Amino acid sequence: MLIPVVCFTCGFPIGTYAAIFDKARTEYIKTKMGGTLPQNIPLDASLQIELKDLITALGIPMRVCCRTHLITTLDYRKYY
Amino acid sequence: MEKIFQNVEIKPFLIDFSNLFIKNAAKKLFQLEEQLPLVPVNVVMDFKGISRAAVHGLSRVLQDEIPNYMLDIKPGGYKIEDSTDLFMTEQFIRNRINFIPIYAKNETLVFALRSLNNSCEVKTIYSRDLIQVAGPKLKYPIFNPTFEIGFLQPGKSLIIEDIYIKKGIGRKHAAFNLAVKTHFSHLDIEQYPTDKKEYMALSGYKQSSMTSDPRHHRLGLCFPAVPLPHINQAVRTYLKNACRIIIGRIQSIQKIYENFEEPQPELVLFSMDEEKTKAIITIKDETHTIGNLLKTYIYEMIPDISFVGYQCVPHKQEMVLTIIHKASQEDLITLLEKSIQNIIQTFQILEKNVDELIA
Amino acid sequence: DTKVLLTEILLDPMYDYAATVARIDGSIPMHKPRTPKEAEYEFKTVIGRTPAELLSQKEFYDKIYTSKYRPDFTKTSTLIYLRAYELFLKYLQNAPNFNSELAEFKTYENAYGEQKALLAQQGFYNIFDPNTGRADQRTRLFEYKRLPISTLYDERGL
Amino acid sequence: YETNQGRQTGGWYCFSWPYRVDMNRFFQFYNEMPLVKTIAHNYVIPNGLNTIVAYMIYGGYNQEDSVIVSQSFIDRGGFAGTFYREEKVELESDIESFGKPDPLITKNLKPGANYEKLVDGFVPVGTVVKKGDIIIGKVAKNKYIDRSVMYGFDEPAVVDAVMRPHGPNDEIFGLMRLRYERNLNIGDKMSSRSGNKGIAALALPTSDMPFTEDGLQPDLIVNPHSHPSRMTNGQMIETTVGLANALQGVVTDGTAFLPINVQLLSERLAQEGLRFNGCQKMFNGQTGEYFDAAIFIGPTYHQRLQKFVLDDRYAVASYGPTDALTGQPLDGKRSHGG
Amino acid sequence: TQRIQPQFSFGRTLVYYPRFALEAQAYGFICNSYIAGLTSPEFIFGEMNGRFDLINKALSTSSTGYANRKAIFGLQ
Amino acid sequence: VSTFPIMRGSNRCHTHHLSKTAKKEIGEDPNEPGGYFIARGGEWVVDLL
Amino acid sequence: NRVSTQSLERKNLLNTISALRTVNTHNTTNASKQTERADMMRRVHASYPG
Amino acid sequence: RKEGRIRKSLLGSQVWSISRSTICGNSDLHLDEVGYPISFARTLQVAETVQHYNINRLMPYFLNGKRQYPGCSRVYKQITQSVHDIEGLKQDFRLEVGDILYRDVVTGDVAFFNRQPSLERSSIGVHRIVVLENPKISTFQMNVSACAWYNADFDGDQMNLWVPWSVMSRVEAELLCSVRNWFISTKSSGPVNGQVQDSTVGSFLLTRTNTPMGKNVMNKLHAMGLFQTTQTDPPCFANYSPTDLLDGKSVVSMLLRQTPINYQRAPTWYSEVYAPYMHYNKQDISTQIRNGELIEGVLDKKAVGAGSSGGIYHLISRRYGPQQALKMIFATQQLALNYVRNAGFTVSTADMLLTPEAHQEVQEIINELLLESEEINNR
Amino acid sequence: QMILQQVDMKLTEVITQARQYFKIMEEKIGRVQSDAIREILTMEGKVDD
Amino acid sequence: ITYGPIETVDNEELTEADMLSFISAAVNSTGLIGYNIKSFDDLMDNGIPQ
Ligand SMILES: [Mg+2]
Ligand SMILES: [Zn+2]
């Protein structure tokens, strides 16, 4: 229901920056989406949203597992 | 000797506040403009003149075999009568709290979570809401305050009263895992260019692992939460404690070796046909670390061994080390004791090098 | 008489809605009742009448708990929540207008849902063709390419 | 196969789950959007996790649709959730009521039953109940005959909610809800979005798992032999794309019939610092020795199918309910004998 | 043993191909590999083949059960 | 004469006149569309025949 | 009974949506098509696409 | 009908003392072994009648009772002609002759393993029980090479397991229904079990002459490590220096010398359709075993595969009995898996990717096919 | 066979003697202390010598 | 209605990922479930009364 406290695969504490990552990702996405509706963002063929620099600035290492679990985990309060 | 544990690089993981999004998010979420009190530290260690078994055993111990501390909820700590929230179940919050990385020196600390949402918005519970109720007052925090424990629906509360510190090892429960693997390489084995199509399907090393015996290694391990000022002390303590754990586990099986003449359930000896003696050592709840170290050093001490090997079958939860040698029981026991002493000497040298390298 | 009333009302989701609204407003304790006395007090505050009083008359929805915040509607989450509870109460009470107010609040809640769906986006990204700065359309699919007949037969027709 | 398996996948089965007393419903705590998502995830919430999967042979423990799972991945909450069971009991007529029976109330008290933990005839919320425990005490009409219902299940539960609502016949009944802590167990079925089912055959500690030179280790180890006959190349392509997605911090769309070029994606892997293939130098976790071959390891979306071994397993002794007609044991686990 | 039959209409195999089409693709010839990806008509033909496989697997159990029971009772 | 089963989310349903927040607070799934019948406790979906 | 219904199995939200979009073949007692028609009706028909 | 009296109650029956669970793989179990969870082992009981010859052996079971494993649950006292609970027999000290003790299932007990639908003579087999003491394991674990008896796979399949408790049934289980009797098929008159999947590929990788890294050799330490899990008595490596190199054929011969057989057949690896391309090693395309010594060739499905008539395991069963064949299957499977533990084996997306030139060649071939079709259309 | 048999009966007699001791240590000297004997007698293996 | 000439429609830059927008518009029009609630509402309003 939240970004996990640690990475499921290796146990790195990705949850230390989960809230900061979520907020910064929202702010960054707001600067890349144009006229498309928020629910149509996953359908925009012109969108190119990269979170690599954001995650790196968070101090999270270049680990496939950690970045995957940070960027892909669903937040329950955003759907409920 | 000769400083087996060669140079070590320590690099903490820090938040880059030059990023505008990160800076704004931290400022308006936690009023955070500096680094967190506990940061992950990446430790890269170079080892020379040491078997791969010893270095990998140290890595495995630091991963999930060194004693470590966790936050846990005592039975009845979750106040059913007061926790009105219907989504923050005890299992979920227990999982979140168990895996918060804590750097605790005192195990008598007890924390409480009293979050009451008397507003119409969904309120997020952070680890900064974990207030200490028992033990000496923390001069320095034992966990970062930015973890999202859970969220409360409007008009709902979450009360947990007995969040205490639990001790254990990673191989039992993963919340006791200490070090996550970052790097492992052999610096004495040449590597192919793996960016080409001819070598992209191969590992990269120019020797087969079935014939190579690397003695120069680089080990990279990340520790999840160490205090920002006392990083070197924390890393030194971790490495020393891993060395002590390995030494104690080896001495535990050494004590079995000293009583080979006395009937021991762990140690069984035979004399089969051709002057050969077979020694079988069965240790319950022993992992691949001790078995691999024992096999490696026995094989080093007895290059002419008839057979040495071990099996840590996932079921039966035990390590069974089998040694067959053209010798007698007494001479075999002396050889195995010498191998044990070699292991202990190597890891004591490692402890000394840790002491004299990380200040 | 009171037992059936209590089991019917305590399991009514309307009771839980009014109870959580009262808890937000602070009119009842934030915890679930632990003694029968405070359970009766919660029933009195949430329903607006004592269980004995309810069994006397017929009206039920008129005295249900109303928010003490007085949230001037005409920051956003609290207004949405309180207006939603007020409209739920008005629907139960069969308010005069309701429908127009319901439509207006549904428009506002659609806007708030737009904002929440913005909060739920995880980024998309499209792989672009370097030659054409659009979604990559290069494929390894088969192309017909009618071939010369010499690829199947020789100069002698075999 | 995926159309079938995607509908049995554990996840957020309902957003109003705490308000419902549902039988055999599993709520999986953590769900991830696939790194390679499709158009369907715009309309239904994704169910599953982006597990790191190494496609290799590890001790022969993943043969014939078996999978080696990371024990740490299980402990951290991977596919963990809550299983809910309901217990609805009704008063047959006015000659029955809810309460705690006593020795004088016995006439038929169940042998080996507890009959404790009953407060006002019901076990309170938050109480662990074991196989012999009596949940909901009911007596008919010694002066009374016991009609209480026993727990009976081998797996212990926790009383999550208990109510006393009136029925359609204006009578009060039971409806206790039992909560089960369900981590991923050995024998729990898992599947990818390409229809590749997998039974968890072995759980390994963190130190025992294989790891790459850069420290990457898998949550699951999938036998490469599951690929050739099945030709589930979509799973391989998804792994390859998600490897670059993770390093790029992006969530690429992988909807069917979209323009796809495996060669271009493999080249895209090289631009992220990885090899042309997704193969990396890995070391054996148990021995610390590198494999001679680079191993294809990367993020693959996996789904926990709601076929729990704890619900399917059954063992019975030489005694239990028998059919009154044939004298044979009753049918199945549900009847507690057969 | 035969190609895709024109069952969509009289002389049509799919809505994607014309009536009395003579190209091999209209009758189930798939020119693309799995790694290259299938087009919609190719995927429809492949789904027809796979559904045939699934139907045969499903009814194999029942037919084998019938024949096996009859043979057992004839030979036991 | 009698009662007639009501499809969840239909015009005769009570959740039809409630907002997403109100549906959330009364134990309904705010994001579910409905389309099923609540009969004898269970939920029943009338499929397309 | 000409009503095609099933229990709402809430395995997930995809299960619910697919249940609401499920088209069921008609069932009749007298014949039920227990001939070569049995495997004809279970095939992907050319009229299905779209 | 099926649910009627005859078929449901007379021809079949519901039974007591039986268990069912999902089956998963366990390569550390022998082919004639089954992994039994301990919780099931304390539910199903074996009826041992107390006599003078077994009183000493059965006394620990009586003392453990219901509190510790291995224990017991019920005792049928002969003097009272009735069953006694173990918690009420705290004053009996010992057991009398003629008493019947219902003890827990222990490792080495025989069990009937069955997978439905039961279509073959091997659909029910008898395995030696290996009790899994991990409380978190609830599955029936079995060797992947034993799946051929039941046509089983580890994707959700459930199997029934019941432990014979009576003496006659146990005698019959260990004498008549053991899976060693089903190694040779009654249907095809050939072997049923063999190497499968990882074991076949591992045998090929271990017995091949060359790797991409050069000659397929290992040092003494890794040659010894191949025999760690074979569960056999290890061969002698005392005549090998630590720097000595051993090829996979040498260790395979070390294993197969225990059951010397003669084998001479071309492997599955050598296929004529592949011969124009590739470059087949001449030492890999003619598998020869002389008196248990692997001289040349690779081991693959033709030699070690399951169901391979004339394979090495069929010959081992013909000359030394099917129990030796099952033991050899387990040993060679352990050898192959331990080899792959170092060699590594994987499949990637690039494994199935043609080069652009090869893609053009494939396109040209399909163009030629479509051109012939178009010529027929023009006709 | 004989040496494996002799050690087998020796072991069974030793285990029987130890557990017969343990049951006596239930009535004589209470359970809580006796359950503490077994607890730290098992982590050194024994429990049956 | 006299539509414009088909020769002047600019479509070469249309990608297959842009047609997902058309599919999304179709789904929004349908709602993926809306037909069943619409049919039940029709039954309630006109079907049963008639
Ligand atoms: Mg199967
Ligand atoms: Zn990670």
Side-chain angles (χ1 to χ4, degrees), chain H residues 26-38:
Chain H
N26 193 332
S27 61
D28 278 318
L29 296 174
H30 289 81
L31 266 74
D32 52 285
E33 284 182 353
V34 59
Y36 205 35
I38 182 168

PDB file of all heavy atoms in Angstrom, chain H residues 26-38:
ATOM      1  N   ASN H  26      12.609 -31.440  -5.486  1.00  0.00           N
ATOM      2  CA  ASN H  26      13.681 -31.516  -4.497  1.00  0.00           C
ATOM      3  C   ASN H  26      14.756 -32.422  -5.090  1.00  0.00           C
ATOM      4  O   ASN H  26      14.623 -33.647  -5.059  1.00  0.00           O
ATOM      5  CB  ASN H  26      13.171 -32.041  -3.162  1.00  0.00           C
ATOM      6  CG  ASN H  26      14.171 -31.850  -2.037  1.00  0.00           C
ATOM      7  OD1 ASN H  26      15.379 -31.816  -2.259  1.00  0.00           O
ATOM      8  ND2 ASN H  26      13.668 -31.728  -0.817  1.00  0.00           N
ATOM      9  N   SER H  27      15.812 -31.810  -5.625  1.00  0.00           N
ATOM     10  CA  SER H  27      16.872 -32.573  -6.271  1.00  0.00           C
ATOM     11  C   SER H  27      17.767 -33.302  -5.279  1.00  0.00           C
ATOM     12  O   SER H  27      18.582 -34.127  -5.701  1.00  0.00           O
ATOM     13  CB  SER H  27      17.714 -31.653  -7.156  1.00  0.00           C
ATOM     14  OG  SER H  27      18.332 -30.632  -6.394  1.00  0.00           O
ATOM     15  N   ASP H  28      17.637 -33.026  -3.985  1.00  0.00           N
ATOM     16  CA  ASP H  28      18.414 -33.712  -2.963  1.00  0.00           C
ATOM     17  C   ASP H  28      17.751 -34.990  -2.472  1.00  0.00           C
ATOM     18  O   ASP H  28      18.299 -35.657  -1.590  1.00  0.00           O
ATOM     19  CB  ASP H  28      18.670 -32.777  -1.780  1.00  0.00           C
ATOM     20  CG  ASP H  28      19.844 -31.853  -2.016  1.00  0.00           C
ATOM     21  OD1 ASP H  28      20.870 -32.320  -2.553  1.00  0.00           O
ATOM     22  OD2 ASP H  28      19.741 -30.659  -1.669  1.00  0.00           O
ATOM     23  N   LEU H  29      16.591 -35.342  -3.013  1.00  0.00           N
ATOM     24  CA  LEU H  29      15.915 -36.585  -2.684  1.00  0.00           C
ATOM     25  C   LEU H  29      16.205 -37.623  -3.756  1.00  0.00           C
ATOM     26  O   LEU H  29      16.304 -37.296  -4.940  1.00  0.00           O
ATOM     27  CB  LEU H  29      14.404 -36.377  -2.565  1.00  0.00           C
ATOM     28  CG  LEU H  29      13.886 -35.470  -1.450  1.00  0.00           C
ATOM     29  CD1 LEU H  29      12.390 -35.274  -1.596  1.00  0.00           C
ATOM     30  CD2 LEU H  29      14.223 -36.041  -0.087  1.00  0.00           C
ATOM     31  N   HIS H  30      16.344 -38.875  -3.333  1.00  0.00           N
ATOM     32  CA  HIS H  30      16.494 -39.965  -4.281  1.00  0.00           C
ATOM     33  C   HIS H  30      15.189 -40.189  -5.038  1.00  0.00           C
ATOM     34  O   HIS H  30      14.119 -39.721  -4.640  1.00  0.00           O
ATOM     35  CB  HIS H  30      16.920 -41.244  -3.564  1.00  0.00           C
ATOM     36  CG  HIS H  30      18.332 -41.217  -3.071  1.00  0.00           C
ATOM     37  ND1 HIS H  30      18.697 -40.602  -1.895  1.00  0.00           N
ATOM     38  CD2 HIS H  30      19.469 -41.729  -3.598  1.00  0.00           C
ATOM     39  CE1 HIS H  30      19.999 -40.735  -1.716  1.00  0.00           C
ATOM     40  NE2 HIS H  30      20.491 -41.416  -2.735  1.00  0.00           N
ATOM     41  N   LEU H  31      15.290 -40.910  -6.155  1.00  0.00           N
ATOM     42  CA  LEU H  31      14.114 -41.146  -6.986  1.00  0.00           C
ATOM     43  C   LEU H  31      13.051 -41.944  -6.245  1.00  0.00           C
ATOM     44  O   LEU H  31      11.853 -41.740  -6.471  1.00  0.00           O
ATOM     45  CB  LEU H  31      14.514 -41.861  -8.274  1.00  0.00           C
ATOM     46  CG  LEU H  31      14.780 -40.958  -9.478  1.00  0.00           C
ATOM     47  CD1 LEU H  31      16.108 -40.237  -9.322  1.00  0.00           C
ATOM     48  CD2 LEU H  31      14.752 -41.763 -10.761  1.00  0.00           C
ATOM     49  N   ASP H  32      13.461 -42.851  -5.361  1.00  0.00           N
ATOM     50  CA  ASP H  32      12.537 -43.644  -4.567  1.00  0.00           C
ATOM     51  C   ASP H  32      12.266 -43.032  -3.199  1.00  0.00           C
ATOM     52  O   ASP H  32      11.885 -43.752  -2.270  1.00  0.00           O
ATOM     53  CB  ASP H  32      13.066 -45.072  -4.416  1.00  0.00           C
ATOM     54  CG  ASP H  32      14.487 -45.117  -3.904  1.00  0.00           C
ATOM     55  OD1 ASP H  32      15.413 -44.814  -4.686  1.00  0.00           O
ATOM     56  OD2 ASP H  32      14.679 -45.456  -2.719  1.00  0.00           O
ATOM     57  N   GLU H  33      12.451 -41.724  -3.057  1.00  0.00           N
ATOM     58  CA  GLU H  33      12.183 -41.010  -1.820  1.00  0.00           C
ATOM     59  C   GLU H  33      11.127 -39.942  -2.062  1.00  0.00           C
ATOM     60  O   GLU H  33      10.955 -39.458  -3.184  1.00  0.00           O
ATOM     61  CB  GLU H  33      13.454 -40.359  -1.263  1.00  0.00           C
ATOM     62  CG  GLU H  33      14.410 -41.326  -0.598  1.00  0.00           C
ATOM     63  CD  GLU H  33      15.628 -40.635  -0.019  1.00  0.00           C
ATOM     64  OE1 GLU H  33      15.796 -39.421  -0.254  1.00  0.00           O
ATOM     65  OE2 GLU H  33      16.422 -41.308   0.673  1.00  0.00           O
ATOM     66  N   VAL H  34      10.414 -39.583  -0.998  1.00  0.00           N
ATOM     67  CA  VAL H  34       9.428 -38.511  -1.042  1.00  0.00           C
ATOM     68  C   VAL H  34       9.596 -37.655   0.205  1.00  0.00           C
ATOM     69  O   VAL H  34       9.800 -38.174   1.306  1.00  0.00           O
ATOM     70  CB  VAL H  34       7.986 -39.059  -1.166  1.00  0.00           C
ATOM     71  CG1 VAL H  34       7.639 -39.967   0.004  1.00  0.00           C
ATOM     72  CG2 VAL H  34       6.986 -37.922  -1.286  1.00  0.00           C
ATOM     73  N   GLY H  35       9.538 -36.340   0.022  1.00  0.00           N
ATOM     74  CA  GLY H  35       9.632 -35.416   1.133  1.00  0.00           C
ATOM     75  C   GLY H  35       8.301 -35.217   1.821  1.00  0.00           C
ATOM     76  O   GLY H  35       7.349 -34.717   1.217  1.00  0.00           O
ATOM     77  N   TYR H  36       8.221 -35.605   3.090  1.00  0.00           N
ATOM     78  CA  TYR H  36       6.977 -35.559   3.840  1.00  0.00           C
ATOM     79  C   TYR H  36       7.055 -34.485   4.910  1.00  0.00           C
ATOM     80  O   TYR H  36       7.934 -34.554   5.781  1.00  0.00           O
ATOM     81  CB  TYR H  36       6.685 -36.920   4.470  1.00  0.00           C
ATOM     82  CG  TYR H  36       5.220 -37.168   4.729  1.00  0.00           C
ATOM     83  CD1 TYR H  36       4.251 -36.682   3.864  1.00  0.00           C
ATOM     84  CD2 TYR H  36       4.806 -37.887   5.840  1.00  0.00           C
ATOM     85  CE1 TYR H  36       2.912 -36.904   4.099  1.00  0.00           C
ATOM     86  CE2 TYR H  36       3.468 -38.116   6.082  1.00  0.00           C
ATOM     87  CZ  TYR H  36       2.526 -37.626   5.208  1.00  0.00           C
ATOM     88  OH  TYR H  36       1.190 -37.850   5.445  1.00  0.00           O
ATOM     89  N   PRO H  37       6.182 -33.480   4.883  1.00  0.00           N
ATOM     90  CA  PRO H  37       6.175 -32.480   5.956  1.00  0.00           C
ATOM     91  C   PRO H  37       5.909 -33.122   7.310  1.00  0.00           C
ATOM     92  O   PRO H  37       5.159 -34.093   7.426  1.00  0.00           O
ATOM     93  CB  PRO H  37       5.044 -31.527   5.554  1.00  0.00           C
ATOM     94  CG  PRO H  37       4.240 -32.273   4.539  1.00  0.00           C
ATOM     95  CD  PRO H  37       5.188 -33.181   3.841  1.00  0.00           C
ATOM     96  N   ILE H  38       6.546 -32.566   8.342  1.00  0.00           N
ATOM     97  CA  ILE H  38       6.497 -33.181   9.666  1.00  0.00           C
ATOM     98  C   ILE H  38       5.088 -33.116  10.245  1.00  0.00           C
ATOM     99  O   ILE H  38       4.651 -34.039  10.942  1.00  0.00           O
ATOM    100  CB  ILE H  38       7.534 -32.530  10.600  1.00  0.00           C
ATOM    101  CG1 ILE H  38       7.522 -33.216  11.967  1.00  0.00           C
ATOM    102  CG2 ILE H  38       7.291 -31.034  10.734  1.00  0.00           C
ATOM    103  CD1 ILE H  38       8.691 -32.849  12.845  1.00  0.00           C
TER     104      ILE H  38
END
